């Protein structure tokens, strides 16, 4: 499995798509000021190297597309996945807690 | 692991701080204790027969004068060993009772804060199971190598 992942065959990409399907991943920007600076998202695989961020959440992130970078963390636990889906999702926090 | 110092040394943690534990526990100022800790002045202990006090801060010249006059009955050491001896010789309970008696007998806003701080530290020491002689250490622990 390790060798065939290193070789990156097509079925490896298919299995990666299968795994990604509904596993939330949480993105955060560097100066996390309030709790809305780290939010969970459903990932969609893109053929590139830059994270594509939904514009409506940018005001929450204080993020603009002039060279900003963001970090990605995988909640690799069932409880962590539920917490990301039920507490961290962008659709969950619409009204700011201020 | 550990290393034996073969001579008591003073913990820099407690001696050098604005609310110095040993400093306000011995009712002596930080200048005098930091002064005896580097052998530049002597502290005599006991000496009830002689006129020397329990916490005298006599210097070297006074030490030779006492040796010429008092001779025996004068017990003074220069290093942290004297501090350890006078820390061990203290009776915590009777000192706390005397401090409480003085505090309730005489009321003064200036000495009240000092008396309350001293009695609080003494009560903490007696109730916590600690011993003041442990403040200055004779054996020094060392960190594990992999750290």
């Amino acid at each position: 499995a390790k060798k065939m992942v290193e070789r990156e065959e097509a079925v490896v990409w298919d299995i990666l798509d299968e795994v990604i399907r509904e596993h939330p991943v949480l993105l955060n920007r560097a100066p996390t000021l309030h709790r809305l600076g780290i939010q969970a998202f459903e990932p969609v695989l893109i053929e590139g190297k830059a994270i594509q961020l939904h514009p409506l959440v940018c005001a929450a992130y204080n993020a603009d597309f002039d060279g900003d970078q963001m970090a990605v963390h995988v909640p690799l636990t069932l409880e962590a996945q539920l917490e990301a889906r039920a507490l961290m999702m962008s659709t969950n926090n619409i009204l700011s807690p201020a | 692991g550990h290393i034996e110092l073969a001579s008591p040394t003073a913990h820099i943690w407690f001696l050098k701080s604005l609310p110095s534990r040993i400093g306000l526990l011995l009712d002596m100022p930080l200048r005098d204790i930091e002064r005896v800790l580097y052998f530049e002045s002597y502290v005599v202990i006991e000496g009830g027969m002689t006129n020397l006090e329990r916490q005298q801060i006599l210097t070297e010249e006074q030490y030779l004068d006492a040796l010429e006059e008092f001779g025996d009955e004068f017990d003074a050491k220069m290093g942290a060993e004297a501090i350890q001896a006078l820390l061990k010789s203290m009776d915590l309970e009777q000192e706390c009772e005397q401090l409480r008696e003085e505090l309730n007998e005489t009321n003064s806003e200036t000495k009240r804060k000092k008396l309350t701080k001293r009695i609080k530290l003494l009560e903490a020491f007696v109730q916590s199971g600690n011993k003041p002689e442990w403040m200055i250490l004779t054996v020094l622990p060392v960190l594990p190598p992999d750290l």
């Binding site: 201020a98 | 309350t116 903490a124």
Partner: protein, 241 residues
Amino acid sequence: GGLPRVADLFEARRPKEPAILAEISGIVSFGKETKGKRRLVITPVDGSDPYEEMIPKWRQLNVFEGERVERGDVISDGPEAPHDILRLRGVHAVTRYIVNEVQDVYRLQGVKINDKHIEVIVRQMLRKATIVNAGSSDFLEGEQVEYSRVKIANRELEANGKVGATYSRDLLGITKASLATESFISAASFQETTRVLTEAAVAGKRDELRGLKENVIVGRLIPAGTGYAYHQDRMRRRAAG
């Protein structure tokens, strides 16, 4: 002005010119043996126990007559410290003053912040009450208001209700009320660690890992959110032995 004042308000720093206040009955007395030390020693009889105050005469006195000056009235004009408001006007007044004053900074710059968040932090500044009575193993010391309230309730429940000791509530800054927590693992990870460790070492105290920072340092579930359910079940097991 500006906003190095949100820090100043939360630090509970006394201003350069405090405005002193009075007691229940501020009868006019002008001076009484003022002499060299200060001047205009006001001696309001107030029926009994007159409250002697000293004024350095560099500040004018506003209320010349008696006028039945009530407690908390401004005897001399000036910016009042939040400490005096707590002592004389009450717990609610110091929250109203802090909230209104800190909202002035935010509202001027067009920032919307709910009043609850400011009041929540003020609650954390209103601990460590001082006892002015005795009988219940408390006497002229700084003690947690939660502990004092719990002990009083137990004493009041029993027949000996007079054992309950009256207390005086204090107001501390955020930098000072943080270091005054009863747990040493926290408040040593925030400010001067040398000072906190020495006091914790001599006292022989315990942390008990009740807050968020302690459990984060150790790595257990924090007692909030999803971890609140786990921490509650553990507490019953300890209580039941």
